[model samples]
Target: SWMANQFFLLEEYTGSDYQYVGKLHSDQDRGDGSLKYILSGDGAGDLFIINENTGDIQATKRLDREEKPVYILRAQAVNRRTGRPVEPESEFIIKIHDINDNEPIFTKDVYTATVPEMADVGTFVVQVTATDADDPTYGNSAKVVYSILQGQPYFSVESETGIIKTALLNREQYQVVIQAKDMGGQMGGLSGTTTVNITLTD
Candidate 1:
């Protein structure tokens, strides 16, 4: 036994749905023992094996960027007293990728706008559009802001361009309530809001 690195090999793992990567060694020439590892294919119970002697990798479960979307983590490294495993090792493999967070959806849950009857003040009744699967620009998840929470005596909203105006002159304010905020924040990132009812004719 020359014990160059003191024999300990097996490195290649990636994770998505949680997280787990592998790498560790505290050499002085093989003294500590008890580090057995084996994880294989299609989400094998998720993952586990963190330093029985000093070999960390962990992610038992809880990565629902949207329901187990991607995962292919493989690992192999064993020899805690002739348990034996060094078939092919070279900082083996690692690939952990999944970042979208998933948030932005509101394609007409219930939206209707109509403002007439003297409509002046600034007059530009309605224009609403919302959809941000995320990656629009990452600050609240992607700018799409418009607000007027329930017919404020008249109406007004054009934060960046979701334009719904009429601050005075309406006088008929039949029904109005509009909101579509997707700066991405509604528990885990994703937004959708709607309510618009304006009817006035004289």
Candidate 2:
């Protein structure tokens, strides 16, 4: 459990030259200059940098979780200048944390569907899906919720599934506006809209 040096770097970090990730210190290491630190594997020495004297690590580049979720790397403390090993090498994971930076987008900007008049409630009308580029494994960054923005009482949308069901109809053809929002549909979350043209007949 001592070797579990899990690190996290937020995606699209636009901070200074090096974003602070965390320090990697060994229990055997003392501040008396007994050991020096180094990193290897993956983007080691390129994307990530470590202070040999302080055993501190930082990121130098922006990352995307959709492209690469995790970076496998090894951290070690060395005694000799050759950097063989004084504390032995151990592998750890650096997770590229995701941000709610993507908005839910419907596959189609416009949807057309036909339903029979007086259709029973909860009838399957149509299902729409919005895609979010954010990492789904993270949090509500990619979670999408659906709501009927324009046409309500005639049609209702499921919050999580984007399923549009029949409730009733007043006109033969109606223009409905459906909204898909990411981040659990909370305020300030990114949102997208699509037009649903519905026609009802006997």
Candidate 3:
């Protein structure tokens, strides 16, 4: 019976200190007409705080959705007059909306591959994969795009599949820099890079 089981929705990377979230209420009749609040559950110690008397809950610090996207908490209200519980403990949910805060992480830091010296222009050289921790359901938050940040003329990266192909053949070892960017490769998107060493064998 506490505030209809509160549900709070917050976005990641919010600025300012002590962002006010919401209040908890109880339906109880007491002599002193005073209520004390307590919050306990997942991420309760460091992430959030509640006013014991006012029932106001606030975020104590910046939140990272990638670290913890959802928090389940239990709220309890007590009647100060009789020193008894106002109502049974209630459960609430806090869902943190994701942002483009996490960079794509490559599975391999360095990839080694061998290609024929006379390899065709479209020959597959290597394949790299990356993962993003952002929310996939949101628009482009976790979508990744692949590109050859360096060694462009010698290598081509498939924008969607992370497949690296040879554009030209040479007798020397090629150090290709492949990059994966999240947030649909838009400006301010987060990116990660990996190296692919292609050894050309005669």
Candidate 4:
């Protein structure tokens, strides 16, 4: 029988399953045939099993973080005729995980701008809205703040509201990079970024 010492990491949609192509030792006496294992942390952190006789594991349904991340499983090999657990029955563990596949999307990927040449310090320039693909309600993952890079000295970003205001109008500084990040704590869990090119008017 084969077993896993530890389970994989669980996060976002890292993937639907984990592939154990050759992670186990095959023994002829243990009814070695062909076994493929795929594990996912289902919603609610429940365990779903598959490949019962074939020696593989798969999700009965698709995996979603709305459920949970970690799942535990007990693996055992038994005598086919006697229906008794074979000696040294292996134990296996699986986990569902997260990945950065989701990009930080702006409310508008391409933003258009036209600011008055004599705009004042308090002038409202533009507003950029962005959101992280990660679920905000979960794990406090959806707190986003806007920011302007140092190079865009003419603009000030409203960290809370994502309002881009003119700190000091400068025609030469027409473009700027805006960033939106989540308040997912020190782990830096939830976040995204974007760039905007602002054009000045005559």
Candidate 5:
């Protein structure tokens, strides 16, 4: 009995060559050089290879889950001499596991907002949008948290919404600095910052 989907983790170790995939074994094999295993699928010929004698497969490249979530592949065992198949081709999926490899980037580097005088604290000023290219469903890798780096006493930011609010406004413009950090916390998370020019009116 063969398995369905084979899972592969996508990450970097900064180590040696070639990542090992998995082995395929058929009961028809006597381990006496009788069978040749052939692998086929997405990136099969160019990115993946199989050991014809041992039925072992290996990877030559690191993958990006954001680019491709999974690869559907098939393998067949055939007679080494006559090129005849002993077993039919079976299918499997290579599921690419995700890792935190992307940083948050804001929609804009600068913004402008206007606030009415005497507006209460927490009044909505403007929203800063940021995106993380990592897979959000996999982990906190794409989860972004907003924070106020400057203009603190005069401005505040919503943690998840990225909405900058008025702590209280002044007539002169306030240069507010807001930061969006992926992974929500600073555990090696990358952050993006945007400045807002908040002008007072009325």
Candidate 6:
């Protein structure tokens, strides 16, 4: 039995060709030993490759953080000469740094809600939900903020939540344009818009 050590790696989303990462090493002091490293789990051996003799790791293809933000891999080292275990299986983590790759997507293209004609201001009308596929753990990358881009005087939307509220009394059907933005609504944030039809009846 040999001691195992864990490691961590980070890579930014480049959407480019395969990139060489780091090497996997064990803590065992096998003097003058030729160690071979094996990687598995989380598609590690498939999407990523490791040099059996040198313990060097490389990406086999471009990675999409939106699809898989993190990868958990297991590594083991064995002595190539004696077929003996040099190190026990250890786990490693690879985190993909997020990029502005995905836009906020509204759950529905159009949302319809009915309210009374005399509904007072600040009355809850409807809740519009949208989702961003970006990595949520990263700063503002997948954070979604809601706003009433149009029809402002008649309707308002909560900045943090997608709750739509009545701002003024209306008697006819009105269309409110709502926008959902990722990246904390910054200037370069990605955004998506949808229409909300509010029908007021007496």
Best by lDDT: 2
What is candidate 6's lDDT per residue for 21-85, written digit by digit as tens? 67777656444447877889887777888888767777866667656777888878887888777
- Model 2, residue pairs in steric clash: none
Question: Which residue segments of model 3 deviate by more than 4 Å?
Answer: 2-16, 26-36, 42-47, 52-54, 80-86, 168-170
Angstrom error at residue 149, model 4 = 2.1
List TM-scores for all candidates, in order. 0.35, 0.82, 0.75, 0.50, 0.82, 0.82
lDDT by residue (78-122, candidate 2, tens digit) is: 875465566768888888888888889999999998878878888
Tell me the spans in candidate 6 whose CA falls farther than 4 Å from its real position. 1-17, 29-33, 41-46, 90-93, 169-171
With a 3 Å backbone cut-off (N, CA, C), the pairs that clash in candidate 4 are: 10-96, 10-97, 11-97, 11-98, 12-98, 43-67, 44-67, 44-68
Question: What does candidate 1's lDDT look like per residue over 68-142, in tens digits?
Answer: 433544555567678776433333333333344544455665567676676679788777667665445335656
Clashing pairs in 3: none
Per-candidate Cα RMSD to the true structure, in Å, reads 11.5, 2.8, 3.7, 10.1, 2.8, 3.0
Ranking 4 against 6 by TM-score, winner: 6
RMSD of 4: 10.1
lDDT of each: 0.53, 0.82, 0.80, 0.56, 0.81, 0.78
Question: Mind giving the per-residue lDDT tens digits that candidate 4 earns over 45-128?
Answer: 233544545545434344544355445555555555566544354445465554433445688765667677778886887888
TM-score-superior candidate, 2 or 3: 2
Which ranges of candidate 5 are over 4 A from the true structure?
26-33, 67-69
Give the runs in model 4 whose Cα sits over 4 Å from its true position. 1-62, 66-103, 169-173, 184-187
Candidate 3 lDDT, 69-155, residue by residue in tens: 778888888877667887898778887766777889999899988878888898998889999988889788789999888887888
TM-score of 6: 0.82
Candidate 2 residue spans exceeding 4 A from truth: 1-3, 81-84, 136-139, 169-173
Q: After superposition, how far is residue 156 of candidate 2 from its true place, in Å?
A: 1.8
Candidate 6 versus truth, CA RMSD in Å, comes to 3.0
